[PDB]
Amino acid sequence: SRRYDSRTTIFSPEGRLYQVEYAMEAIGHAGTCLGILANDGVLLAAERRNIHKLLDEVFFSEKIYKLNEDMACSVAGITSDANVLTNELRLIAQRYLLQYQEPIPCEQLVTALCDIKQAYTQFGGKRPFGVSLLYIGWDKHYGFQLYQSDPSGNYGGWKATCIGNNSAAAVSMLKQDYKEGEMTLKSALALAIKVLNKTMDVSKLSAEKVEIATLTRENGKTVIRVLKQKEVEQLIKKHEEEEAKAER
Amino acid sequence: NQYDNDVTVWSPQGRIHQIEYAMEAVKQGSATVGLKSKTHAVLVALKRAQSELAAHQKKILHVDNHIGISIAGLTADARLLCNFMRQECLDSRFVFDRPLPVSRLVSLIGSKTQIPTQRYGRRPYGVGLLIAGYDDMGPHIFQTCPSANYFDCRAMSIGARSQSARTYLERHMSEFMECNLNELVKHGLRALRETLPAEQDLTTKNVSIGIVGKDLEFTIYDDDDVSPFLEGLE
Amino acid sequence: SIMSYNGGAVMAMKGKNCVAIAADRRFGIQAQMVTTDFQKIFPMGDRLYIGLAGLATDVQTVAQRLKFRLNLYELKEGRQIKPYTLMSMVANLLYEKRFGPYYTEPVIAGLDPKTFKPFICSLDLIGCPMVTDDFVVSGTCAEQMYGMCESLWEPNMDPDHLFETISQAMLNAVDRDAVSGMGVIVHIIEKDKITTRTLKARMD
Amino acid sequence: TTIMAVQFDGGVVLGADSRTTTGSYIANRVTDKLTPIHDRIFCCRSGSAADTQAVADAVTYQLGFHSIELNEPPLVHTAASLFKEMCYRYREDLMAGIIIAGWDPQEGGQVYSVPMGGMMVRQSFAIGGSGSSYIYGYVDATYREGMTKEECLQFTANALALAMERDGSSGGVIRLAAIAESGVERQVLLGDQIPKFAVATL
Amino acid sequence: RGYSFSLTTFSPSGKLVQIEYALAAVAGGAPSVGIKAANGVVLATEKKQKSILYDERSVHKVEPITKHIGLVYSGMGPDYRVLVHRARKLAQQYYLVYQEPIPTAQLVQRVASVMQEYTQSGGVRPFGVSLLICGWNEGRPYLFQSDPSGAYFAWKATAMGKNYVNGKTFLEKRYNEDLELEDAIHTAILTLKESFEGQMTEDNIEVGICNEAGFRRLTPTEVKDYLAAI
Amino acid sequence: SRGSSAGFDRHITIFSPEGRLYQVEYAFKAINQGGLTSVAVRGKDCAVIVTQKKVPDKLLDSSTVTHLFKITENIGCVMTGMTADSRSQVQRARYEAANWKYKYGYEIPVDMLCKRIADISQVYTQNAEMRPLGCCMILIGIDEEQGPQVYKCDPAGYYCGFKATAAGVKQTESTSFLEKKVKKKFDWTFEQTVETAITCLSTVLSIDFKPSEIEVGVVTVENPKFRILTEAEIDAHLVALAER
Amino acid sequence: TTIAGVVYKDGIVLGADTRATEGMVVADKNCSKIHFISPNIYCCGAGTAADTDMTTQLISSNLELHSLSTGRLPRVVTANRMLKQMLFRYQGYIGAALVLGGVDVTGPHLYSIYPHGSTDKLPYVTMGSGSLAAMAVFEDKFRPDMEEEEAKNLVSEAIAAGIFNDLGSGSNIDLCVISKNKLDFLRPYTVPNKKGTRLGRYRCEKGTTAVLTEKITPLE
Amino acid sequence: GYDLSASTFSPDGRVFQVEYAMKAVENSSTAIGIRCKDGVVFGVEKLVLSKLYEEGSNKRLFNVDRHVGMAVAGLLADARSLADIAREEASNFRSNFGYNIPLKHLADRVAMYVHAYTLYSAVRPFGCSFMLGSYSVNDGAQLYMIDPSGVSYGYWGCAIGKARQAAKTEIEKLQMKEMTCRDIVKEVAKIIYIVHDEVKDKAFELELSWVGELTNGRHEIVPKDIREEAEKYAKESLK
Ligand SMILES: *[B]([O])([O])[C]([C][C]([C])[C])[N]C(=O)[C][N]C(=O)C1=[C]C(Cl)=[C][C]=C1Cl
Ligand SMILES: *[B]([O])([O])[C]([C][C]([C])[C])[N]C(=O)[C][N]C(=O)C1=[C]C(Cl)=[C][C]=C1Cl
Ligand SMILES: [Cl-]
Ligand SMILES: [Cl-]
Ligand SMILES: [Cl-]
Ligand SMILES: [Cl-]
Ligand SMILES: [Cl-]
Ligand SMILES: [Cl-]
Ligand SMILES: [Cl-]
Ligand SMILES: [Cl-]
Ligand SMILES: [Cl-]
Numbered sequence A: 001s002r003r004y005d006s007r008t009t010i011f012s013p014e015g016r017l018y019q020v021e022y023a024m025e026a027i028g029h030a031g032t033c034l035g036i037l038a039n040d041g042v043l044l045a046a047e048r049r050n051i052h053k054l055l056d057e058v059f060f061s062e063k064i065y066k067l068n069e070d071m072a073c074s075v076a077g078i079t080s081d082a083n084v085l086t087n088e089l090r091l092i093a094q095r096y097l098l099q100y101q102e103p104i105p106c107e108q109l110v111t112a113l114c115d116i117k118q119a120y121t122q123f124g125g126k127r128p129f130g131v132s133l134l135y136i137g138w139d140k141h142y143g144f145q146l147y148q149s150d151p152s153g154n155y156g157g158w159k160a161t162c163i164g165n166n167s168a169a170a171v172s173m174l175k176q177d178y179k180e181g182e183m184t185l186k187s188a189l190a191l192a193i194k195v196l197n198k199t200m201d202v203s204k205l206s207a208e209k210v211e212i213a214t215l216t217r218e219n220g221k222t223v224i225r226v227l228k229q230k231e232v233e234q235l236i237k238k239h240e241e242e243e244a245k246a247e248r
Numbered sequence B: 001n002q003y004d005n006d007v008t009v010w011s012p013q014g015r016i017h018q019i020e021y022a023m024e025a026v027k028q029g030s031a032t033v034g035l036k037s038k039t040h041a042v043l044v045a046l047k048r049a050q051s052e053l054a055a056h057q058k059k060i061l062h063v064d065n066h067i068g069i070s071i072a073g074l075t076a077d078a079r080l081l082c083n084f085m086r087q088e089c090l091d092s093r094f095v096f097d098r099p100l101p102v103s104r105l106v107s108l109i110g111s112k113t114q115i116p117t118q119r120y121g122r123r124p125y126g127v128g129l130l131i132a133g134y135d136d137m138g139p140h141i142f143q144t145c146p147s148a149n150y151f152d153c154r155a156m157s158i159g160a161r162s163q164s165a166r167t168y169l170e171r172h173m174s175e176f177m178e179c180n181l182n183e184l185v186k187h188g189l190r191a192l193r194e195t196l197p198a199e200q201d202l203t204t205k206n207v208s209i210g211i212v213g214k215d216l217e218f219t220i221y222d223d224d225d226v227s228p229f230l231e232g233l234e
Numbered sequence C: 001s002i003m004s005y006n007g008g009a010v011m012a013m014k015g016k017n018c019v020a021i022a023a024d025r026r027f028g029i030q031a032q033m034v035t036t037d038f039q040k041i042f043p044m045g046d047r048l049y050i051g052l053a054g055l056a057t058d059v060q061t062v063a064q065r066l067k068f069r070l071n072l073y074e075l076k077e078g079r080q081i082k083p084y085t086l087m088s089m090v091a092n093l094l095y096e097k098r099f100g101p102y103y104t105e106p107v108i109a110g111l112d113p114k115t116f117k118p119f120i121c122s123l124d125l126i127g128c129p130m131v132t133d134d135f136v137v138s139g140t141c142a143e144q145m146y147g148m149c150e151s152l153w154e155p156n157m158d159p160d161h162l163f164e165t166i167s168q169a170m171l172n173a174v175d176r177d178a179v180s181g182m183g184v185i186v187h188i189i190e191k192d193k194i195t196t197r198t199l200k201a202r203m204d
Numbered sequence D: 001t002t003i004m005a006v007q008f009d010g011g012v013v014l015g016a017d018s019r020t021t022t023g024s025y026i027a028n029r030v031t032d033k034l035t036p037i038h039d040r041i042f043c044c045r046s047g048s049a050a051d052t053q054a055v056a057d058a059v060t061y062q063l064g065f066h067s068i069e070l071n072e073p074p075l076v077h078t079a080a081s082l083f084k085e086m087c088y089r090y091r092e093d094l095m096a097g098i099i100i101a102g103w104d105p106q107e108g109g110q111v112y113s114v115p116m117g118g119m120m121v122r123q124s125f126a127i128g129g130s131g132s133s134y135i136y137g138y139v140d141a142t143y144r145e146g147m148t149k150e151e152c153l154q155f156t157a158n159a160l161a162l163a164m165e166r167d168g169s170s171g172g173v174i175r176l177a178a179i180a181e182s183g184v185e186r187q188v189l190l191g192d193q194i195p196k197f198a199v200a201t202l
Numbered sequence E: 001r002g003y004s005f006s007l008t009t010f011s012p013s014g015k016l017v018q019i020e021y022a023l024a025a026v027a028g029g030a031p032s033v034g035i036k037a038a039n040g041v042v043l044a045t046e047k048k049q050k051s052i053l054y055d056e057r058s059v060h061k062v063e064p065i066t067k068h069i070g071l072v073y074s075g076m077g078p079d080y081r082v083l084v085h086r087a088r089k090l091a092q093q094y095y096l097v098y099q100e101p102i103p104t105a106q107l108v109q110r111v112a113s114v115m116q117e118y119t120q121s122g123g124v125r126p127f128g129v130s131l132l133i134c135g136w137n138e139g140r141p142y143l144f145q146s147d148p149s150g151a152y153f154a155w156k157a158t159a160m161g162k163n164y165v166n167g168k169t170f171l172e173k174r175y176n177e178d179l180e181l182e183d184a185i186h187t188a189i190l191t192l193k194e195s196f197e198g199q200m201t202e203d204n205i206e207v208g209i210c211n212e213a214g215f216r217r218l219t220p221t222e223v224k225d226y227l228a229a230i
Numbered sequence F: 001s002r003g004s005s006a007g008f009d010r011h012i013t014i015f016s017p018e019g020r021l022y023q024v025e026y027a028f029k030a031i032n033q034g035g036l037t038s039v040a041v042r043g044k045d046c047a048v049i050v051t052q053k054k055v056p057d058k059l060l061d062s063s064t065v066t067h068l069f070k071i072t073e074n075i076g077c078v079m080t081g082m083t084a085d086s087r088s089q090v091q092r093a094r095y096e097a098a099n100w101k102y103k104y105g106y107e108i109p110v111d112m113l114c115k116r117i118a119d120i121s122q123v124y125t126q127n128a129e130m131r132p133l134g135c136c137m138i139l140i141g142i143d144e145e146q147g148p149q150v151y152k153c154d155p156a157g158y159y160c161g162f163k164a165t166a167a168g169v170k171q172t173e174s175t176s177f178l179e180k181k182v183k184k185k186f187d188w189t190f191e192q193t194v195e196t197a198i199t200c201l202s203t204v205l206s207i208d209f210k211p212s213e214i215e216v217g218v219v220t221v222e223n224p225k226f227r228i229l230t231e232a233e234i235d236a237h238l239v240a241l242a243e244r
Numbered sequence G: 001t002t003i004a005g006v007v008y009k010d011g012i013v014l015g016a017d018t019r020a021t022e023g024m025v026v027a028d029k030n031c032s033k034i035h036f037i038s039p040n041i042y043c044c045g046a047g048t049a050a051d052t053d054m055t056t057q058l059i060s061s062n063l064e065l066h067s068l069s070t071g072r073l074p075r076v077v078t079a080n081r082m083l084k085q086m087l088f089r090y091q092g093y094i095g096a097a098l099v100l101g102g103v104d105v106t107g108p109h110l111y112s113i114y115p116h117g118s119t120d121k122l123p124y125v126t127m128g129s130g131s132l133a134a135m136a137v138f139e140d141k142f143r144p145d146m147e148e149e150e151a152k153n154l155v156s157e158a159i160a161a162g163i164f165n166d167l168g169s170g171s172n173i174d175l176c177v178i179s180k181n182k183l184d185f186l187r188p189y190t191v192p193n194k195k196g197t198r199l200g201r202y203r204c205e206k207g208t209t210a211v212l213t214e215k216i217t218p219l220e
Numbered sequence H: 001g002y003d004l005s006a007s008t009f010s011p012d013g014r015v016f017q018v019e020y021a022m023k024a025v026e027n028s029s030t031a032i033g034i035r036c037k038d039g040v041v042f043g044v045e046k047l048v049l050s051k052l053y054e055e056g057s058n059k060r061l062f063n064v065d066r067h068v069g070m071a072v073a074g075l076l077a078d079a080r081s082l083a084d085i086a087r088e089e090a091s092n093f094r095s096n097f098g099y100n101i102p103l104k105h106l107a108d109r110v111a112m113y114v115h116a117y118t119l120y121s122a123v124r125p126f127g128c129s130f131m132l133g134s135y136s137v138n139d140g141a142q143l144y145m146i147d148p149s150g151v152s153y154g155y156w157g158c159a160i161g162k163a164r165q166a167a168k169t170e171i172e173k174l175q176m177k178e179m180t181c182r183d184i185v186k187e188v189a190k191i192i193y194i195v196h197d198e199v200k201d202k203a204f205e206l207e208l209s210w211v212g213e214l215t216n217g218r219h220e221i222v223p224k225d226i227r228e229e230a231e232k233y234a235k236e237s238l239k
């Protein structure tokens, strides 16, 4: 029925896809989520929105998802949509392992999901998924990698990036502080906290309010770990001591 | 207005504007005439020519040995319906080894053409047909419409300025039953001629004739083959 | 017989706080040995292994498709799969093919990922599970294996004694079977380590 | 199996033996082969136990629904036609030899045979199953037009007893039912209540 | 055939308004409460029950999913009945495959996923319900909420429906980690009294509990007893 | 809020800004278009349905004008609201019951039948392409353990069992009448069940009936088969009431 | 297999042996053949083991969905209909031969169910390759309205008759007793067979087995 | 607006698309049925829109089974499609159950098919009302009428189309319970002549059919000579 169809998969007069753009507005309001590539690893750091006192803390993270043995992601946008996409990511990665008996290379996983997102903009008459994703991974072709995808089904690779609230401000801080070829997991961790400290300007930054995951290689094996709160408090402490030095 | 775009939307006066609009396609077609006697059924059609160098559109179509049609409205819809009629006739010969009775064929058309008038996104057929046939019940002239209704006729005309042709046919219809073939065709031609601007005449380029009856399979006459019928409109 | 086309034998066996699983190493086609290092035992966890005997192509397919399911299960759930739950997962996979089955009859051996209690079982080709407290056997020399296991196995054996018993059960059983052998591999599973050995074995 | 039904003025009598066999093992020695399909309509079942139970359950369903929709008792002819439709349609996958009998207010007592293959014919009396072979002659000689209900019961019990004596696949108890406007009356003949005919000693 | 286009879409400010409006149906529902004690979970709800004419026992808001899992809701009752049925079926499908009762979180994830579908799939509106789901597995109690978007959250205690914002602040100033189940049942009922209007009987509230023995509804006579102190 | 509207929320079953479903609300109004009221009451021994029987036209065969339907031999029903919608819901209940019996081997309990019908109605409130049915079903039957039962379900897909209930134009007034009467009764339970139903109906309409102006159907613990009273049977009740 | 059931005064007694065979080899000595259907209904299984397992699990599950919905304890007739309609649909290719017994609102009921989908409702039934041995015990000794202990004695004797006279049956006797008031799942009920004890010792000391290769992998 | 789709209720609980379809019926010329002691008689005022049409063109009286007649008013192509539905339901009933479909059941089945077209945006309601009549020794005479909403009731007398009320008021004057079909045909013809507006619509054919003891329970056209006598009685009665 033509009267009720809101026509989610058509062009506007300037060649735009409004549902896609409107979905990108939803993402820009979600929790800030950054990714940083180093020489010995990659990390994801995300603002937690689940912070009410009475929440129970039952899973290992809020927005960090393991995808397969060598990859993880984080998300900004509609949570339920993110649950659908991450489930589909895990399936794709296992279909590839089944078929080739080696892990899916990172960019091929990202591309495979992005083709699904693209299809939702072109046919079917459905709303797109209100999700942007950061992917971290290791594979044997390109080593440590960091990708970003959005509701248009576009993606790109990054050395550092940010999605969600105050992204623009976070990317400027990264542009300035990030050292191409010269970062370590320890200095990327420091930069991540520095960035979140300026972009959560509502308000004073706390371990309860962030989640950090790191991805490294130890003895021919990928290790993916969500940092315990003790470790996050220590990084925040160190960042605050560092600002004590800042003048003299 | 809000009631005129969808064949599924009844208006508040209990009409369906899409069906009425589809009937306009038939009123703007070129005229055709159908009439019958005790022994023959005749179709006469005016063929409209797009330019002086164009042939003149086919208006009369063969359905089966005992059935032909004349068309007014969307040609592509005419062909779709004609193909359905052909297939129903072939089926009845295949299964029963005898010609499909003309009135049963026309019931089939009614039932087929009704369906899209009741389903969203579908449209009526934009074509009206005059149907000439002969069977155990004698000769027949039937008329079909985009509304899916159909009519059993002594004679009929549809298309542009067809009202003149109907008036002529009412005026002389008490004569039709007892006419020989020649008389009957002439009556068809004179009715058709009433539809024309005063200047213009029936010619071998613009007239087409179809005849079926007791001794005669459905046959179409065009071009030089209509000259005998046009001579001695005297 | 379809199950003797490739030949092969697996067994598992329970001790005190430990389990053992063993397999011959022959990949052959009827009479012809093709290779002598063919894998029939596959890790489904740090302390949980599945051994498959039967048609070599289905050994491989069932191991792979099982792994696909298990990986999805572990990512979705918080956690490492329990031994009993793996059995069920495998039962379900096999019975889905009830009317055109995979020709493989697996054994599972493991320790519970939280309690470390010993677990062993076997299943038939359509997924009927059998849990035991001693041993299980599958392959073309099942009768030979039963004879050795029934005579040698004892309750509450330590890792060293379990190793000796499973080894002797396997070696002597396969030595009466034309299409099993060409080497035996044995895994002992303990809380704190896995020990993997190939045995000195007849190669005819 | 041996099954039988007989029309009388105002109703029907139905009977069956009670033996279910797999090979020559008796899996049930007291089977109830007379199954109610509606308040005054029964079927007697022979052939495959599984097939006849499944078909009877399905027809009970169809007839019950039909009867609620019409708000009237079903015709015996309608029950029979439903059996026939299913037994004819699936004749290649079913082994079912059925007798449908009952009472309705329009046509009274009626007996229909639906033998294997799915034809349907009304009869004054019907016999079926493996044991029926042994009683064609008996029933052809003994049947009389205008029998009472009680005579029909006796005639049916005698016929079934004779069949049961000779057919390895029939035996056990005789189950009888009488159906009329006033309702259904069921009984069992067992042991010494089964009519007896001496074996012929020299 | 069915409308194949989404009835929930993005507004220019990035909102899925149909989900927002579903949340407004929830907020206008009858109040519901969940409190995770140290040794169990309690779910309690008010019956929006006019009339003495109602047979209070004929339909239940607090429902078993499995031996070990139960549900209550706030918002549209008939929508809830759809989700109870699907949750039960999801729980059985799990059991047939794994031969272990479904962990509470896995059940929530699967139900939440059904709710997400109804925000995107063609020709349908979202569910106008939020669920509170309790269970016991791996030696421990769980309380979850699942909202019309398909988002789900693990709570120590919460309230939903009419006056939920105040209910939550009442629980904040009253829940503690070491609290027992018998105490928790009380505080759940007190939380309902905060927004009641009507005088509470055992016939116009429903209470369910989850512990190591399993999930069950408290009987009228058991509720009556907890109400004597309140 | 307070009667707000956006987009197509008055045309299809999508949420309004307050979270309402206008199209479902309008289906309740459609129940009243027929101008009729029904009442049902359950006691310890029976359950009863009473409804108005309006035959305005003399040319109608009044034996075909009814709102009482047999669903199974043991379940009866009264329908209120749009007539063809009601017939359709009656057929579907007949189908559900018969199918339950075939699959499960015992008669469908009245509560499960009412629930199933309600769950079917729910789909119409969540799927945009069809309207809700503008009718309300009241079912009566005997449960072996709980005694006589009265269940009602509505176009929102809500359902409930009752001591007594009503439907149609004077539903509220009937509800108040019945509430006032049970409060007075011991163990809050109706005892004179046919009388209460007819009296309730007669009060809220202000009519005082002839036996041809109402229909009455019953199920009892001693006689669980659903029964429609004849005129003469109904008249005996009207006369017993008239004299006290 | 030998499986059997009896209706007694106050309920049902079900019985079974515990042998499973693969060919003419014992594969399981302690197979559990008495399956949960619902808290008041159990089902013995004979025939193809995967099929008895899967069929009873599926029906138990669909019945749990049914009772959750009705709020009532299920009926034996219901389990019977569901099992038979499924087995009929599969035309005998699901090789489940079942003894279904329970106690419901209408009292105790016992059915035998065959792979092609026929069922018989009877006060005593037997299935499996030992079914004739067990049936002979029943024909010889069954009485109506037995007491609980008499009925348990009789079902164990009938299972024993299969265990000892049928090569397809062996090992232990399991019972299940179901009344209005009680469910006793007696596994094992009796252990009439036992492995003899080992006269020699084959405790092979470390190094007896020659080893080609070893790898220790430490875990957490 | 609230009146575009049969899947949309108006705010007062009406389905305007069904009501508009009913208006199509109410614009059509009048058809009547009368049940009497020994059957059912149908009459239709069949307006002749052109003298070029054959006598009998556009019948509004159909045989839907050998024992069942149908009389229609409204959009004729919709009515014919309904006649075909009724025919198929009767046929399929005989094939499945093995006897002639009872009238009431046929009426209820086709009513439910009509009703199915009043729920959805995907289809439009039928623009027709129709009567079904039969007779058998077992069931007596039965006359049902079905409207575009799918409501179905039984009647002693019934009229549909634009002079419906004028027709009904004349039908009420007859003691039809005590009359035979032969007497009733004359009265049907009479009533059609009464309600026909000869000023506004110039020409009509009377169409008559019946089913009753006199046709042995077969629905049949009234024979030509009986119809002519009935017309003549009606015309002189108009005097
Ligand atoms: B009778 O035709 O001999 C009798 C009638 C049935 C309807 C009771 N038939 C049989 O006994 C034929 N037997 C079976 O169908 C059967 C029974 C059992 Cl227990 C198992 C397998 C089979 Cl195929
Ligand atoms: B009994 O019917 O003899 C018994 C019942 C089961 C439930 C234990 N049946 C058997 O022992 C027959 N064997 C199996 O179904 C079987 C077959 C296969 Cl292919 C593999 C293993 C087993 Cl255990
Ligand atoms: Cl992986
Ligand atoms: Cl991988
Ligand atoms: Cl044209
Ligand atoms: Cl054209
Ligand atoms: Cl027209
Ligand atoms: Cl025209
Ligand atoms: Cl797979
Ligand atoms: Cl049987
Ligand atoms: Cl036969």
Ligand SMILES: [Cl-]
Pocket: D046, D096, D097, D098, D114, D115, D116, D127, D128, D129
């Ligand atoms: Cl036969």
Ligand SMILES: [Cl-]
Pocket: D018, D019, D020, D026, D028, D029, D030, D170, D171, D172, D173
């Ligand atoms: Cl016998």
Ligand SMILES: [Cl-]
Pocket: A001, E002, E003, E004, E005
């Ligand atoms: Cl669409």
Ligand SMILES: [Cl-]
Pocket: E084, E085, E088, G068, G069
């Ligand atoms: Cl449910």
Ligand SMILES: [Cl-]
Pocket: E066, E067, E091, E092, E095, E100, E101, E102
């Ligand atoms: Cl469970």
Ligand SMILES: [Cl-]
Pocket: E064, E215, E216, E217
């Ligand atoms: Cl409970």
Ligand SMILES: [Cl-]
Pocket: D057, D060, D061, D064, F098, F101, F102
């Ligand atoms: Cl049934």
Ligand SMILES: [Cl-]
Pocket: F185, F189, F190, F191, F192, F193, F196
């Ligand atoms: Cl009272």
Ligand SMILES: [Cl-]
Pocket: F105, G077, G080, G081
């Ligand atoms: Cl049954």
Ligand SMILES: [Cl-]
Pocket: H025, H026, H129, H159, H160, H161, H162, H164
């Ligand atoms: Cl009208």
Ligand SMILES: [K+]
Pocket: D163, D164, D165, D166, D167, D168, D169, D170, D171
């Ligand atoms: K015999």
Ligand SMILES: [K+]
Pocket: F012, F013, F124, F125, F126, F127, F128, F129, F130, F131, F132
């Ligand atoms: K809707």
Ligand SMILES: [Mg+2]
Pocket: C174, C175, C176, C177, C178, C179, C180, C181, C182, C204
């Ligand atoms: Mg060897």
Ligand SMILES: [Mg+2]
Pocket: C203, C204
């Ligand atoms: Mg060799």
Ligand SMILES: [Mg+2]
Pocket: D051, D093, D094, G091
């Ligand atoms: Mg078969």
